[PDB]
């Protein structure tokens, strides 16, 4: 049983990292885009400002700015997918 379990860990624990990726929850990111996230996304994509510059301008931490930008990208991707499905 131990040998079988080691073979199991060798096979499936290498696929368990990607199993969560394939089983990612389909979070309904259909809510209105927050002002801070929208400003961060506009600065990074349109104004072409570095995230350090965004943090300096908005008086926010670099990690928080990065999290807000990733959230903004996530809900914009969800909205774009919804628009493509409806068009």
């Amino acid at each position: 049983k131990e040998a079988i379990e080691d073979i199991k860990t060798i096979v499936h624990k290498g696929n368990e990292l990607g199993s969560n990726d394939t089983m990612t929850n389909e979070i309904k990111f259909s809510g209105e885009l927050s002002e801070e996230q929208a400003k961060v996304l506009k600065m990074r994509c349109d104004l072409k400002y570095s995230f350090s510059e965004i943090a300096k301008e908005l008086e926010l931490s670099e990690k928080e700015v990065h999290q807000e930008f990733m959230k903004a990208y996530k809900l914009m991707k969800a909205n774009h997918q919804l628009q493509l499905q409806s068009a």
């Binding site: 290498g14 990292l17 990726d21 990074r44 994509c45 349109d46 072409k48």
Partner: peptide
């Protein structure tokens, strides 16, 4: 281009 975004993921299978 800062607008262009590369989506990277790291797993033990890939």
């Amino acid at each position: 281009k800062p607008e262009v975004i590369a989506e990277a993921s790291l797993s033990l299978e890939y």
